[PDB]
Write a protein that binds this ligand. Structure first.
Ligand SMILES: [Cl-]
Ligand SMILES: [Mg+2]
Ligand SMILES: [Mg+2]
Ligand SMILES: [Mg+2]
Ligand SMILES: [Mg+2]
Ligand SMILES: [Mg+2]
Ligand SMILES: [Mg+2]
Ligand SMILES: [Mg+2]
Ligand SMILES: [Mg+2]
Ligand SMILES: [Mg+2]
Ligand SMILES: [Mg+2]
Ligand SMILES: [Mg+2]
Ligand SMILES: [Mg+2]
Ligand SMILES: [Zn+2]
Lengths: 129, 188, 49
RNA sequence: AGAACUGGCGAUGCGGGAUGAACCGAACGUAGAGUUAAGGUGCCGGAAUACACGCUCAUCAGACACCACAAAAGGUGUUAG
RNA sequence: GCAGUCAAGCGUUCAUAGCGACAUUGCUUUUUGAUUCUUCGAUGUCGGCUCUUCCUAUCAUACCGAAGCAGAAUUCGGUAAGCGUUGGAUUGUUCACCCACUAAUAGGGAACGUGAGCUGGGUUUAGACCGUCGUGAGACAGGUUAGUUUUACCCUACUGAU
């Protein structure tokens, strides 16, 4: 499970691609496990699995829907130790619905909450916060 | 069709004393005493001798007469309860998970506990009604015996134990697991 | 356990089913005890496994 | 929507149908007394919580013409044949 | 539009688990017609937005019955409206069709709820263009573009306040 993290990536947000799968950015279209409310946009945070389409990248990666996992968040959130922290930008990696990464390497830091939830992200990550 | 008169006979054994007044019935026997309130039938009790008692209905319809025979049966069950007693026997039925049944004392209430029914972690507790004694019979595998003077108390207590072990979300024709009554009889 | 299986069968299998309201009924009943179907006499045995 | 015979409303109040142009009773000067119509007589409400033989118990009873709805098909509910 | 009765048949065998021909009895007023009673000294008119409440013929959630219910999944039925029933691409659209999430994305009423609440894209004044029709003026439930949305201080209702 994951303790609640402030949402900063509603549907339509474009985040950088952090792995070496060939994609350069991710276009979020949906968030897994999201609720329902009139007029409310589904939003994602660190560690959430989303549905994304590649807008800029290799031609074989574009024009289709694939799962993705957010690894960095520019919106500040509060940990249970009391500190408010945020990253320099928003980033994610391409994964299959089971959670295994399409690529094999991650560039840049990865949030601790995302690393705990996904063992595959932790193995392919270099620095955790 | 508003029958003029209908009667039933109640046989009183040698060792049993019956006191009836204002439809309050009390029976005294070697095994104990029983009481019953019957102020909902509108019948008339009359005594012939120390060995025979008659109960009658005057100018009663089909539905009213049908309850006259019920009153006779209830009083008869009271009489044989205090002279012979009732004994209900139940058997444990399971396929894979053994059923563990024990007697426990929770804040002086004398419950009976059921363990490991279909591998469930839930603890099943059934209260034991007053006047009912529970003993696990020997030389018979997975049998529990309930005894008492009141047939309703014994039968209802055994019924509560059977209903508490019902299978859910499964084909009950295949999952024949539970505790079922196997014999109804008398202590003597 | 042929003896114990038969004992459990009479409580779970040896039954009658009302055609109109699916109620579980005794094997030898001629009418359903439910008021929703008006005590209908259209009854069938419970299907065997 | 359109015809036939008669009675009505329109042109008409009054008692009754809770309420209503047409139904029921009855048609109208101003008053008194008596008797009734149709409809009613547990209380609202004037008048028997009258008498008599039965039937019915509904975990969506039933209750009065016009009139403000219910059917086919069923029930070892109960009653008579 | 929805629900029954009968049971020739389907269902490997077996009418009625689940379906069901030939016939036949109903219910509903969220379809469309039929009619012309009310309104032409005028009841503001399509859809959306916003917001409340109601109906159950129940999509999901609670508890159950039934199966051709081993398990898993699913199907049929009961008590139930307590609680929920969404985010988007195209279209003025109601409707429809896809993408995606979700326990589920159920159907309806309230003067076809709701314009002195909004909005004005559509329809339905006057400008203009095209096609077909007409000798012509002009016509088209055919297409296209541009086109003023007024007033509450009164009574009541409601929300708060003496
Ligand atoms: Cl012309
Ligand atoms: Mg005139
Ligand atoms: Mg009337
Ligand atoms: Mg009076
Ligand atoms: Mg006319
Ligand atoms: Mg006017
Ligand atoms: Mg006006
Ligand atoms: Mg108005
Ligand atoms: Mg309207
Ligand atoms: Mg306006
Ligand atoms: Mg208005
Ligand atoms: Mg316009
Ligand atoms: Mg114009
Ligand atoms: Zn039935």
């Amino acid at each position: 499970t994951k303790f609640r993290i402030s949402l900063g990536l509603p549907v339509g947000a474009i985040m950088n691609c952090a792995d070496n799968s060939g994609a350069r950015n991710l276009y979020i279209i949906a968030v897994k496990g999201s609720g329902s409310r009139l007029n409310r946009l589904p939003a994602a945070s660190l560690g959430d699995m989303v549905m994304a389409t590649v807008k800029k990248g290799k031609p074989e990666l574009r024009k289709k829907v694939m799962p993705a996992i957010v690894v960095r968040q520019a919106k500040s959130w509060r940990r249970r130790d009391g500190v408010f922290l945020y990253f320099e930008d928003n980033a994610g990696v391409i994964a299959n619905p089971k959670g295994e990464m399409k690529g094999s390497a991650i560039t840049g830091p990865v949030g601790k909450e995302c690393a705990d939830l996904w063992p595959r992200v932790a193995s392919n990550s270099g620095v955790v916060v | 069709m508003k029958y003029i008169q209908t009667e039933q006979q109640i046989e009183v054994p040698e060792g049993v004393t019956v006191s009836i007044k204002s439809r309050i019935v009390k029976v005294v026997g070697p095994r104990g005493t029983l009481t019953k309130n019957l102020k909902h039938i509108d019948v008339t009790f009359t005594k012939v001798n120390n060995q025979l008692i008659k109960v009658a209905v005057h100018n009663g319809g089909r539905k009213h007469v049908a309850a006259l025979r019920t009153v006779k049966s209830l009083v008869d069950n009271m009489i044989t309860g205090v002279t012979k007693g009732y004994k209900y026997k139940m058997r444990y039925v399971y396929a894979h998970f053994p059923i563990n049944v024990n007697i426990v004392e929770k804040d002086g209430a004398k419950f009976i506990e059921v363990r490991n029914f279909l591998g469930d972690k839930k603890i099943r507790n059934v209260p034991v009604r007053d006047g009912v004694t529970i003993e696990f019979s020997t030389n018979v595998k997975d049998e529990i015996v309930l005894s008492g003077n009141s047939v309703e108390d014994v039968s209802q207590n055994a019924a509560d134990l059977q209903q508490i072990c019902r299978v859910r979300n499964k084909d009950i024709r295949k999952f024949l697991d539970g505790i079922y009554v196997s014999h109804k009889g008398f202590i003597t | 356990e042929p003896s114990l299986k038969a004992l459990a069968s009479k409580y779970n299998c040896d039954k009658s089913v009302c055609r109109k309201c699916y109620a579980r009924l005794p094997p030898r009943a001629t009418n359903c005890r439910k008021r929703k179907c008006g005590h209908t006499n259209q009854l069938r045995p419970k299907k065997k496994l």
